[PDB]
């Protein structure tokens, strides 16, 4: 054997074990979700409070690309940052040449091709992050989830990290119970609940909730963080549902 | 990364030998024997073709003996493909010297440069060495008739008579026995063939399994002529010495 | 003499057919209206070689854009033209009018002068012969004209530009961009001269 | 720099080279040796652009000396001249060419013959019985055409050379402060101290 | 990132073998039989068209390729490796010869250039040798008709006739019995078809056999008239119909 | 045994990395089929959306390379999209350089040559994909050309790819034995799509809803994919016969 | 160059 | 085991061993403490000597007038990363006439460390850093790990027996955070914090290294007789 | 400072019955100053003859360059280069230096060893091939040579007659040019013998 | 003087046979009709070496392209490759070409200027004699020309250049590219400038020329 | 260079 020692090597199965090993690093990470809604997308993430000494609200994990795209990831946080830095360069060169802000599907392939490139050579390591991202473009709302292999699809709801199965189950219910669609303000409250429910799989350390959203009506198509009254309203909603 | 798959071609053994050079020489020891004999009035190059097939085109074939310029030729022992890379380099180097100095390149200068290229492949670049040993037969107005050999190590030495390739041990003993300094070309032709005829792994030495060449001053007055022997000319010289 | 005019149903491009090498007319039936995409065309003025090389690169960029992200906007096409014209301003003599039809944005006209600046306008005129019809075009142009009104406006405008500009002449080619599709029009001297 | 002469006779090559180094309205030096020994039996005189002359001469000298050590053998005058010509032939199409004219006087030990080569800064080589660079030629060539014989001795060659220096001292506008004379023969290179 | 493989993947073993070249020759042995026969007035090269699927159109896959108007090539071994070699072989005939001398290279020199490309894959960093043996048939004014074999090592040999690949050992024996120095081109085509029938197992017709000749100039295939010195290509690919005509009088 | 990790020869003259790339082809467990009409070339592929949270519109293994050329992939989506983007760039550059639309068979050869390089050069791995290119070429007419990780390519009368490729292959072979011709003798592309789906249903033995299939159609001067409703209309036509 |  | 040869290789459980071995170099390093109030941010570093004849390895480096860090692990790697910060701080000043935000300083270090963990040939940084600074959003303390993970904290400690000081600060959190407009009292809390990581050795005059930055205080380092006040 | 007219010189080539002739002056000067009366401008590589006029440094350089190339040609092709092929090699080599050219006017002359056909060709400094049945001219007295050759030349001249025609064409053209003359050489080329004659001409 | 004329079932191009250096006729019978591919021919004006070199380079790359694509080369391919090459060199390659030929797409006629601009037309003329030629073309050209009518119009347009333009002279070269047929290259289609018998033979009595030295030259090895 |  030895097929798992080098990146870009096919096993006799036709598998790249180094990419599958990167997925294990993602599974180890904190829970992050994405919810597609009527006219936009909502992102939420679990931030484990390791110590009292962590400054609340001042270790921000959700990142913005351009002005209209939100990116969140689970796994190796630095690898996620490296991918967003690339995303920002890709989105900048698109706007520079074509004037219009990068469409979400266009942007999704730019990350997809870049992550896939890191499975072609033994001189590079695959990305240790699954990235949930999306936003609002000319064709409306788009939610995407991108995996270490370079695989990505469009999603109604997306979840990754240690509490992915719990979050996926809760997401599948929302899709069933709301066939006509979920509103932006609802999706923020549901996002809070699903992070709190997904926290059961990581319940040693207590956590800090962080939500962002893009909405054509609520945020005018731009990416904004949920803060203050709207954040505390979503936390209270989540607290009421666990009890 | 790629470190895993690196053979490390340019390293020393604990005994202070170059693995790849030693193994390249082992490769050459299986190649058809090539003999060079230097006489007072010319040089002979004789070489045994590697187990010939009856349907091989013999007359329009070149395997062992190559022309570098009008005054210098080489006998090859090893990978033909490797030799042709080095030969085209040697041919260019000769023309560079002629272009620069308006004089035909001295034999040793050409040999040294070709040997220096082989040396490079043993000390840097992480590539395999050239699996080739040359016998250089040439003439210049400084040292006259000269025989050299170079090997994959990039080391070269001068000779009165020398063999490379297969059965060099046996071939060198026979040359060392019958060679003398006042020897003529026609005598050296006979010695070269008699040596191959005894060291050959074949049943009998025939015209179709030989390449032959002489570098004489046998042209008209104080000028050198290169003669790459034709099949029929090898057939005649083989009968004339009484081998067939 | 080239111009592009927006109207109710979309946009119309118009141009003369004269190519000059000094005072000699190298080509009297030139097509100065070039398709960079299905419903994005451009008007070329300045160096024939420069505008040709630019238009070819833009056509390539928008073909590759279409393969990845679908139909580009007229604004996107104008941005690609600008990017080439602006970044190579020292080595280019190209004045290009970009005109296209979206279903959302309807008819749009972008003019790109020598500098490589972009100007989005209701209508645009350019080339040597445009100088003679600034007065006429400003007095006669109206927004939300009909197809027939816009064709007459371009025909009369280029007719005057051709009459006064020695560098302009031959036939008046026009290209109509609407939801209906693409329509090529031609008008011969015997018609437009006696307007 | 300015005056460099060369005369090939029966058994030797004689090079005469002016001693003056002028910059502006001042003769800075009157004892300058405008020559380098390339090998024991090869001497090169030089004239041209300030700095370039010595920089080029010493560069050639270094290369020939390197060859001599490597092969433990003296290059023929013909071989050295060909090498020098190729260096100047490269130079002329460089970013900043060497503006240096040279005479190469050598004794070929294999042929037992003196050889004089005239090479200008373009890399224009000629073998001559007598040679000169600059304005010197315009006086000496016609004088040597008359007085030169191919079978002359070294002493006859020096008298023929004295005749050239006298003519140059009489008709040349600039004071070149006499010449350093050097003889190249079978026994190598030596300098005439009283000229 | 970047190609970190700057070292030889083909090295000498203690026994003096170059493993990757030997293994490449093994890949050639597995490959389908192809042969070449030289006549007095032409050369024939032939091979079996091993179809991957009956739904596949075997006409679209060309095993016999034109390199120059007077030179053709056929192979045994890995088809993809052959395809890229034909691309490189065609280009080098222009860049390193025709764009210099304003005429097509002679057979031996083009073969020499192909051999160089295959030798470099044996020594250069981070590459394996080519998994093919080529048979190159060609004509030029001063050398006449010639047939060359090129091996993965980059070694090439001139042949009166030879075969490579699956049933080469038997095919070579067959050619030794039939070959003489007085063979006319038609006689060489006849022997080529006889030799190839021994190695072919399934269907044996113009649709499963690929055969081309280097013979007389073809003015009809030139595509223009008016230049007397330009008389057309000597390379001609025999049609499916032209093969079946000769299989009746077999 | 490092001769199984990189693209160098094994003692028996094999490239194991190329062979293992072929096995990656079937990782998606999807079967594709391509046939030619008189005027058109139809390609159909199974569409499996297991996750309920997926946006089914974004799940696709058919690609619009140029206006005229369409490409279906059998293999993982990262390598599929890698190949698609490169083919799109190659087709665009070809048009710019040579002043005419890149033919289906020339693009196939170009992508095959790229695939060949990965089998010879060590640092680059093969893509674990089989690319099926379809068009109505302006010279050769209806065209199917298929590429694999070995760098092999060839034209096809018709073809199938995937786990149950052999069952589909023999199903089509038997039809062309019977019809005695190289194509589907049909006027409209609508009925050539109906033929493609019918013969896939017979070979695989499964029934298809509108969301279980993905259809690409190549006509003269455009290649396009069918919507769910375009397929549903097509499925209704088959059922009522 | 030629140059409306 | 088989997956620790280089940084480009993942383990079967999804670990980067070369990064974890780099993390180990920090634990071997001498203890250093970071803590801040709303007005000031303080670094306290226990310096280490080779023997009694040797000097004490300097732990604290200044990056700008308003920013600097303390190191634990490979000192040369700290010199490389501190030099990079100095340049980034300096770039922000010359180009934008703008003092570099302590948060951006962290983001830049994270991205620099990350590139060394994904490429063949290179190695991870073998040092941990505590960055303090005062910018437009008040006092800040960062913890840099060579994995790339940067974390903003009220207080922390890294190095050998850092757990002692980190527990103390976790208890004292409510007290020291409200030491506003009092430098000497915030340092005292930092000196008392590092004292919880001492074994057999005590804080001497050439052993203790303190640094402070704040509202009306440039980043200044105290060594020798200047720290005698706090023993 | 016109590179083509610093050193001066002329070359002329003609065709006869189963023969070719190529002739050149011997002058090398620096503008007004005559420097050498031994500077031959005709070289040969096997049976193919090349005359080169123009800047003398480039004449010498190109001779050395074509000797280099024809030597490698012969080693690889195992045969002497033919005039038609050599002509193409000269054209290639000159056009390679399109935007930094050799200031030369080369002239190829020789008989194809296979066909036996007499062949001549001329080039501009940038490599444009000028093939001709009758004659080629090059140098500072090209106008003069054109006027002489156009009037004196007739087809199918015997070698002995052709010698007189080319010799008179060169001499009388050279005597109306300040930068040409100072001696002359004529090559008479038959299928398998070549005669070289030095002409007596006025030395001013 | 170079012209191109479109007709029923293809395209014809023609050129004069004069090469000049200043006011001097360098070549009285040069060929300005170049082959890019068997059925794509180029008429060249401007810098003689540039028209030959750029035609051969694109002709070489077209042959390689034809072999690569297994397709007969198209005129638009030769047009695209020529214009992108010429444009890259900003007119410093002084090649003014009339590109014409037949391909699977049909029959085509284009012109290319040195700066990299391309035109389309039924009748085109380039070079110093372009105005003399274009005057004839504008006078006599019509839609739906036959082959024999197009050759006549083309050669007539070249003759206008030969007689009236000092830059043009000697003979008329023609190349006819018809669809479905081999392109026929008509070298010296017209020779209306044959030199009249000279009044006198200038054959010298043998020994007229004074000789200093004779020597046998060794061409053998 | 020569120059129709
Ligand atoms: Cl390719
Ligand atoms: Mg007008
Ligand atoms: Mg590989
Ligand atoms: Mg005179
Ligand atoms: Mg005079």
Compute the distance between CA of residue D41 and CA of residue D74 in angstroms, rounded to an integer: 8
Which residues in H lie closer than 8 A to residue E4 (C-beta atoms)?
Answer: 120-121
Element (H, E) at C89: none
Q: Between I and K, how many residue pairs show a Cβ–Cβ distance under 8 A? A: 3
Whole-number Å distance, alpha carbon B37 to ligand 1 midpoint, is 51
Q: DSSP per residue over E185-209, as a string?
A: HHHHHHHHHHHHHHH--S--STTTE
Check CB contact under 8 Å for F85 and C68: yes
The reply to whether residue B5 touches residue F123, judged by beta carbons under 8 angstroms, is no
Q: What distance in Å separates residue F99's CA from the closest CA in chain C?
A: 10
**In whole angstroms, what is the distance from residue B208 CA to residue B227 CA?**
17
Shortest CA distance from A7: residue in chain B? B1
**Beta-carbon separation of C72 and A103 below 8 A:** no
Q: Residue B221 contacts by C-beta under 8 Å, 6 or more apart in sequence?
A: none
The residues spanned by each domain of chain A are 1-243
For residues A129 and A73, is the Cβ–Cβ distance under 8 A?
Answer: yes
């930068």: which residue's tokens? I179
Catalytically annotated residue among A1, A30, A131, A160: A30
Q: Which tokens hold the place of D135?
A: 């304005």
- Locate the DSSP E strands across chain B: 34-39, 42-48, 65-67, 72-78, 132-140, 144-150, 156-159, 161-164, 210-216, 225-228
Name which of J175, J72, J75 is nearest J118 in CA terms.
J75
- Per the structure, the complete domain to which residue H186 belongs is given by 1-231
With beta carbons under 8 A apart, name residues in chain J contacting I125: none
Is the Cα torsion angle F87, F92, F94, F95 positive or negative in sign?
A: positive
Q: G touches F (3+ CB pairs < 8 Å)?
A: no
Domain boundaries, chain E: 1-249
d(CA I45, CA I68): 10
How many angstroms separate the CA of residue K3 from the nearest CA in chain I?
A: 9
From the CA of I204, how far away is ligand 5's center (Å)? 4
Chain B interface mutation, best of D68, D69, D86, highest count of B Cβ atoms under 10 Å: D86
Closest CA to J19 of J3, J35, J31, J36: J31
Burial I139-172 (b: 16+ CB within 10 A, else e): bbbbbbbbbbbeebbeeebebeebbbbbbbbbbb
In 3-state terms, what secondary structure has residue E32?
coil
Nearest Cα residue in chain J from I152 = J202
C125's CB contacts (< 8 A; 6+ apart) are C1, C2, C3, C133, C134, C137, C157, C161
The CA I26 to ligand 5 mean position distance, Å, reads 13
Closest CA to B146 of B162, B130, B169: B162
| Length reported for chain I | 204
Query: Subunits touching B (CB < 8 Å, at least 3 pairs)?
Result: A, D, E, F, H, I
- Phi, psi for D180 (deg, rounded to 5): -95, 120
Judged by DSSP in three states, C39 sits in coil
Provide the 10 A C-beta neighbour count for residue F2. Answer: 12
| Multiple choice CATH, I1-204, 3.30.365.10, 3.20.20.120, 1.10.10.10, 3.60.20.10 | 3.60.20.10
C-alpha B215: how far from chain center: 13
CATH 3.30.390.10 describes domain A1-243: no
Ligand nearest to the CA of F5: 3
Instruction: Report the number of distinct structural domains present in chain H.
Output: 1
The dihedrals phi and psi of D79, each to the nearest 5 degrees, come to -65, -45
Neighboring chain E residues of I48 at a CB cutoff of 8 Å: none
- Interface contact D82-B142, CB threshold 8 A: no
Pairing of strands J40-46, J33-37: antiparallel
* Tokens encoding D149: 């014989």
DSSP state of B231: H
Report yes or no: D124 and I57 within 8 Å, Cβ to Cβ: yes
Angle between helices E107-123 and E79-93 (to 10 degrees): 130
Residues in chain H with CB shorter than 8 Å from the CB of A18 are 9-10
Two structure tokens written together for C50: 């420069």
Instruction: Evaluate whether E77 touches E149 at the Cβ level (below 8 Å).
Output: no
DSSP summary character for residue E97:
I
Edge-to-edge order in the sheet of strand C40-46: C33-37, C40-46, C94-101, C107-112, C119-121
Report chain A residues whose CB lies below 8 A from the CB of H151.
54, 59
Minimal CA–CA distance to C195: which of C169, C157, C167, C166? C157
What span, in angstroms and rounded, lies between the C-alpha atoms of D73 and I71?
27
The experimental resolution of this structure, in angstroms, equals: 2.8
Secondary element (H or E) of residue B31: none
DSSP E239: P
CA D53 to chain centroid, in Å, comes to 12
Q: Residues 103-142, chain H: which have Cβ within 8 Å of E?
A: 119-121
Is A30 considered catalytic here?
yes
* CA gap B46, F108 in Å, rounded: 52
CB contact under 8 A, F121 and E3: yes
Phi, psi (5° rounding) for residue C11?
-150, 145
CA I124 to chain E, closest CA, distance in angstroms equals 17
Burial (CB count <10 Å: 0-12, 13-18, 19+), residue B57: middle
Q: How many B×D Cβ pairs under 8 Å?
A: 20
Cα distance between residue J199 and residue J212, in whole Å: 33
- Cα–Cα dist F28/F60, whole Å: 12
CATH superfamily of D1-195: Aminohydrolase, N-terminal nucleophile (Ntn) domain (3.60.20.10)
- Alpha-carbon gap, residue I128 to J32, rounded angstroms: 12
CATH number of the domain encompassing residue H198? 3.60.20.10
Rounded to whole angstroms, the maximal C-alpha distance in chain K is: 14
Residue of chain G minimizing CA distance to C165? G4
SS3 C171: coil
How many Å apart are CA A24 and CA A21, to the nearest integer?
Answer: 5
Neighbouring chains of E at 3+ CB pairs under 8 Å are A, B, F, H, I, J
Question: What CATH number is given for F1-241 in this structure?
Answer: 3.60.20.10
H32-36 sheet: strands from edge to edge: H155-158, H32-36, H40-46, H208-214, H217-222
DSSP state at residue E212: E
Instruction: Choose among A164, A136, A134: nearest CA to A72.
Output: A134
Handedness of CA E118, E123, E127, E128 (dihedral sign): positive
Nearest to C90 by CA among J90, A221, E46, E42: J90
Two tokens, residue J164: 């009236």
The closest CB to that of C56, out of F65, F91, F96, belongs to F96
Please state which CATH number belongs to domain E1-249.
3.60.20.10
> Taking the CA atoms of chain K, what radius of gyration do you get in angstroms?
5
Domain architecture of chain B: domains with CATH: 1-244 (3.60.20.10)
For chain C, what is the total number of helices (H) and then of strands (E)? 5, 12
Expt. technique: X-ray
Which residues, at least 6 apart from A114, have a Cβ–Cβ distance to it below 8 Å?
Answer: A83, A86, A90
């Amino acid at each position: 054997t030895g097929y798992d020692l080098s990146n870009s090597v096919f096993s006799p199965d036709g598998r790249n074990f180094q990419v599958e090993y990167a997925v294990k690093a993602v599974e180890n990470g904190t829970t992050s979700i994405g919810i597609k809604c009527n006219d936009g997308v909502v992102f939420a993430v679990e931030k484990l409070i390791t110590s009292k000494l962590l400054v609340p609200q001042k270790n921000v994990k959700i990142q913005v690309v351009d002005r209209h795209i939100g990116c969140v990831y689970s796994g190796l946080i630095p690898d996620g940052r490296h991918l967003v830095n690339r995303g920002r360069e890709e989105a900048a060169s698109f706007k520079k040449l074509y004037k219009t802000p990068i469409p979400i599907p266009a942007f999704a392939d730019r990350l997809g091709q870049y992550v896939q490139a890191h499975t072609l050579y033994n001189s590079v390591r695959p990305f240790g992050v699954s990235t949930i991202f999306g936003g609002v473009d000319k064709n409306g709302a788009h939610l995407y989830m991108l995996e270490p292999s370079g695989s990505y699809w469009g999603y109604k709801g997306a979840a990754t990290g240690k509490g992915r199965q719990s979050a996926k189950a809760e997401l599948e219910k929302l899709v069933d119970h709301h066939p006509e669609g979920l509103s932006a303000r609802e999706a923020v409250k549901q996002a809070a609940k699903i992070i709190y429910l997904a926290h059961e799989d990581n319940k040693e350390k207590d956590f800090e909730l962080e939500i962002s959203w893009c909405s054509l009506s609520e945020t005018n198509g731009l990416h904004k963080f949920v803060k203050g009254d709207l954040l505390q309203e979503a936390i209270d909603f989540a607290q009421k549902e666990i009890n | 990364g790629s470190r895993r798959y690196d053979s490390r071609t340019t390293i020393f053994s604990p005994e202070g030998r170059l693995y790849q050079v030693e193994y390249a020489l082992e490769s050459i020891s299986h190649a058809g024997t090539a003999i060079g004999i230097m006489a007072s009035d010319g040089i002979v190059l004789a070489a045994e073709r590697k187990v010939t097939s009856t349907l091989l085109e013999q007359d329009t074939s070149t395997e062992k003996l190559y022309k570098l310029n009008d005054k210098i030729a080489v006998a090859v022992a090893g990978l033909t493909a490797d030799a042709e890379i080095l030969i085209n380099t040697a041919r260019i180097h000769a023309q560079n010297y002629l272009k620069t100095y308006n004089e035909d390149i001295p034999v040793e200068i050409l040999v040294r440069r070709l040997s220096d290229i082989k040396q490079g492949y043993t000390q840097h670049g992480g590539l395999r060495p050239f699996g080739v040993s040359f016998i250089y037969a040439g003439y210049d107005d400084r040292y006259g008739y000269q025989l050299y050999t170079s090997n994959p190590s990039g080391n070269y030495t001068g000779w009165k008579a020398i063999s490379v390739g297969a059965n060099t041990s046996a071939a060198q003993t026979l040359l060392q026995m019958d060679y003398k300094d006042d020897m003529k070309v026609d005598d050296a032709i006979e010695l070269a063939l008699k040596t191959l005829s005894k060291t050959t792994d074949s049943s009998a030495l025939t015209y179709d399994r030989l390449e032959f060449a002489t570098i004489r001053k046998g042209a008209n007055d104080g000028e050198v002529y290169q003669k790459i022997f034709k099949p029929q000319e090898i057939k005649d010289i083989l009968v004339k010495t009484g081998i067939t | 003499s080239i111009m592009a005019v927006t109207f109710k149903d979309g946009v119309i491009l118009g141009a003369d057919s004269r190519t000059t090498t000094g005072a000699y007319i190298a080509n009297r039936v030139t097509d100065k209206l070039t398709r960079v995409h299905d419903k994005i065309w451009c008007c070329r003025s300045g160096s024939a070689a420069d505008t040709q090389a630019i238009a070819d690169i833009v056509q390539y960029h928008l073909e590759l854009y279409t393969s990845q992200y679908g139909t580009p906007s007229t604004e996107t096409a104008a941005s690609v033209f600008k990017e080439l014209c602006y970044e190579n301003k020292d080595n280019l003599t190209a004045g290009i009018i970009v005109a296209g039809y979206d279903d959302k944005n309807k008819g749009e006209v972008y003019t790109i002068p020598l500098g490589g600046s972009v100007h989005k306008l209701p209508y645009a005129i350019a080339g040597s012969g445009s100088t003679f019809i600034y007065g006429y075009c400003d007095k006669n142009f109206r927004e939300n004209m009909s197809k027939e009104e816009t064709v007459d406006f371009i025909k009369h405008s280029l007719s005057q530009a051709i009459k006064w500009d020695g560098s302009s002449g031959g036939v008046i080619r026009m290209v109509v961009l609407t939801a209906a599709g693409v329509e090529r029009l031609i008008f011969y001297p015997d018609e437009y001269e006696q307007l | 720099m300015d005056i460099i002469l060369g005369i090939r006779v029966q058994d030797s090559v004689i090079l005469a080279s002016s001693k003056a180094v002028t910059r502006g309205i001042s003769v800075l030096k009157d004892s300058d040796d405008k020559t380098r020994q390339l090998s024991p039996h090869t001497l090169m005189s030089f004239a041209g652009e300030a700095g370039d002359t010595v920089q080029f001469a010493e560069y050639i000298q270094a290369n020939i000396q390197l060859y001599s050590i490597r092969e433990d053998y003296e290059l023929s005058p013909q071989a050295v001249s060909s090498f020098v010509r190729q260096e100047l032939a490269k130079s002329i199409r460089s970013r900043r060419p060497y503006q240096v004219n040279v005479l190469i006087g050598g004794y070929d030990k294999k042929k037992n013959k003196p050889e004089l080569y005239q090479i200008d800064y373009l890399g224009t080589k000629v073998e001559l019985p007598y040679g000169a660079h600059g304005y010197s030629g315009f006086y000496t060539f016609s004088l040597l055409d008359h007085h030169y014989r191919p079978d002359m001795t070294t002493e006859e060659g020096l008298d023929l050379l004295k005749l050239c220096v006298q003519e140059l001292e009489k008709r040349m506008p600039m004071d070149f402060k006499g010449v350093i004379v050097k003889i190249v023969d079978k026994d190598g290179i030596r300098q005439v101290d009283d000229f | 990132m970047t190609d970190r493989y700057s070292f030889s993947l083909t090295t000498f073993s203690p026994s003096g073998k170059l493993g990757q070249i030997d293994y490449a020759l093994t890949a050639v042995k597995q490959g389908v039989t192809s042969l070449g026969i030289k006549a007095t007035n032409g050369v024939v090269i032939a091979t079996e068209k091993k179809s991957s699927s009956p739904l596949a159109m075997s006409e679209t896959l060309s095993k016999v390729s034109l390199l120059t108007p007077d030179i053709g090539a056929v192979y045994s071994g890995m088809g993809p490796d052959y395809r890229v070699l034909v691309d490189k072989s065609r280009k080098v005939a222009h860049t390193s010869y025709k764009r210099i001398y304003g005429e097509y290279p002679p057979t031996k020199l083009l073969v020499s250039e192909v051999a160089k490309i295959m030798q470099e894959a044996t020594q250069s960093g981070g590459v394996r040798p080519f998994g093919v043996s080529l048979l190159i048939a060609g004509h030029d004014e001063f050398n006449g008709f010639s047939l060359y074999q090129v091996d993965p090592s980059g070694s090439y040999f001139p042949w009166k006739a030879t075969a490579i690949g699956k049933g080469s050992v038997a095919a070579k024996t067959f050619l030794e019995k039939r070959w003489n120095d007085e063979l006319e081109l038609e006689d060489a085509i006849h022997i080529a078809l006889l030799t190839l029938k021994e190695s072919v197992e399934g269907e044996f017709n113009g649709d499963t056999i690929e055969l081309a000749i280097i013979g007389d100039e073809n003015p009809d295939l030139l595509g223009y008239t008016g230049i007397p010195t330009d008389k057309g290509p000597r390379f001609r690919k025999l049609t499916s119909q032209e093969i079946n005509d000769r299989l009746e009088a077999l | 045994g490092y001769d199984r990790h990189i693209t160098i020869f094994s003692p028996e003259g094999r490239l194991y990395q190329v062979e293992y790339a072929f096995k990656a082809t079937n990782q998606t467990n999807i079967n594709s089929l391509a046939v030619r009409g008189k005027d058109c070339t139809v390609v159909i592929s199974q569409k499996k959306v297991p996750d309920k949270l997926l946006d089914p519109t974004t799940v696709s293994y058919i690609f619009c390379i140029s206006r005229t050329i369409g490409m279906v992939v059998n293999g993982p989506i990262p390598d599929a999209r890698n190949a698609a983007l490169r083919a799109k760039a190659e087709a665009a550059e070809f048009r710019y350089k040579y002043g005419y639309d890149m033919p289906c068979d020339v693009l196939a050869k170009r992508m095959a040559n790229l695939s060949q390089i990965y089998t010879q050069r060590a640092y680059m791995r093969p893509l674990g994909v089989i690319l099926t290119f379809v068009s109505v070429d302006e010279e050769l007419g209806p065209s199917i050309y298929k590429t694999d990780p070995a760098g092999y390519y060839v034209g096809y009368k018709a073809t199938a790819t995937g786990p149950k490729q052999q069952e589909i292959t023999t199903n089509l072979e038997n039809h062309f034995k019977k019809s005695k011709i190289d194509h589907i003798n049909e006027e409209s592309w609508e009925k050539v799509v109906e033929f493609a789906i019918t013969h896939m249903i017979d070979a695989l033995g499964t029934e298809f809803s509108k969301n279980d299939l993905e259809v690409g159609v190549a006509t003269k001067d455009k290649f396009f994919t069918l919507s769910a409703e375009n397929i549903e209309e097509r499925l209704v036509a088959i059922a009522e016969q | 160059x030629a140059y409306x | 085991n088989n997956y620790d040869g280089d940084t480009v290789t993942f383990s079967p459980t999804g670990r980067l061993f070369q990064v974890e071995y780099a993390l180990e170099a920090i634990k071997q390093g001498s203890v250093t403490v970071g803590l801040r109030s709303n007005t000031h941010a303080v670094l306290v570093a226990l310096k280490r000597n080779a023997d009694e004849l040797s000097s004490y390895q300097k732990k604290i480096i200044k990056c700008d007038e308003h920013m600097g860090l303390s190191l634990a692990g490979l000192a040369p790697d700290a010199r490389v990363l501190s030099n990079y910060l100095r340049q980034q701080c300096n770039y922000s000043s010359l180009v934008f006439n703008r003092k570099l935000a302590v948060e951006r300083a962290g983001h830049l270090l994270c991205d620099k460390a990350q590139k060394n963990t994904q490429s063949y040939g290179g190695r991870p940084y073998g040092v941990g850093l505590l960055i303090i600074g005062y910018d437009k959003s008040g006092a800040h303390l960062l913890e840099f790990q060579p994995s790339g993970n940067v974390t903003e904290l009220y207080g922390t400690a890294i190095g050998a027996r850092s757990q002692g000081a980190k527990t103390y600060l976790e208890r004292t959190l409510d007290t020291f955070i409200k030491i506003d407009g009092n430098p000497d009292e915030l340092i005292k809390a930092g000196v008392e914090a590092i004292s919880q990581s001492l074994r057999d050795e005590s804080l001497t005059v050439d052993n203790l290294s303190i640094a402070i930055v704040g509202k009306d205080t440039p980043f200044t380092i105290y060594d020798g007789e200047a720290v005698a006040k706090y023993i | 400072s016109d590179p083509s007219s610093i050193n001066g010189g002329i070359v002329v080539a003609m065709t006869g019955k189963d023969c070719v002739a190529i002739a050149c002056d011997l002058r090398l000067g620096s503008q007004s100053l005559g420097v050498s009366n031994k500077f031959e401008k005709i070289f040969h590589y096997g049976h193919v003859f090349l005359g080169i006029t123009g800047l003398a440094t480039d004449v010498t350089t190109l001779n050395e360059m074509f000797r280099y190339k024809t030597n490698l040609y012969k080693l690889k092709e195992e045969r002497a280069i033919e005039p038609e092929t050599f002509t193409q090699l000269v054209s290639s080599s000159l056009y390679e230096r399109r935007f930094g050219p050799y200031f030369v006017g080369p002239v190829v002359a020789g008989i194809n060893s296979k066909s036996g056909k007499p062949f001549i060709a001329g080039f501009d400094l940038i490599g444009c091939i000028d093939e001709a049945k009758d004659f080629i001219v090059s140098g500072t007295a090209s106008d003069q040579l054109f006027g002489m050759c156009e009037s004196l030349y007739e087809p199918n001249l015997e070698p002995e007659d052709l010698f007189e025609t080319i010799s008179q064409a060169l001499l009388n053209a050279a005597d109306r040019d300040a930068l040409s003359g100072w001696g002359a050489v004529v090559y008479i080329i038959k299928k398998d013998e070549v005669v070289k004659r030095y002409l007596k001409m006025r030395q001013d | 003087t170079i012209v191109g004329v479109k007709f029923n079932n293809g395209v014809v191009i023609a050129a004069d046979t004069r090469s000049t250096q200043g006011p001097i006729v360098a070549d009285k019978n040069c060929a300005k009709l170049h082959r890019i591919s068997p059925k794509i021919w180029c008429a060249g004006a401007g810098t003689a070496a540039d028209t030959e070199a750029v035609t051969q380079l694109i002709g070489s790359n077209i042959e390689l392209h034809s072999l690569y694509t297994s397709r007969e080369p198209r005129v638009v391919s030769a047009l695209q490759m020529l214009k992108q090459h010429l444009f890259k060199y900003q007119g410093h390659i002084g090649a003014y070409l009339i590109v014409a030929g037949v391909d699977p797409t049909g029959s085509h006629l284009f012109s290319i200027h040195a700066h990299g601009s391309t035109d389309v037309g039924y009748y085109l003329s380039l070079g110093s004699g372009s105005l003399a030629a274009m005057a004839v073309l504008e006078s006599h050209w019509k839609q739906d020309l036959t082959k024999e009518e197009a050759i006549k119009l083309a050669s007539d347009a070249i003759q206008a250049g030969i007689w009236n333009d000092l830059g043009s002279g000697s003979n008329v070269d023609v190349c006819v590219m018809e669809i479905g047929k081999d392109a026929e290259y008509l070298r010296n289609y017209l020779t209306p400038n044959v030199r009249e018998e000279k009044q006198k033979s200038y054959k010298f009595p043998r020994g007229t020329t004074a000789v200093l030295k004779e020597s046998i030259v060794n061409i053998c090895d």
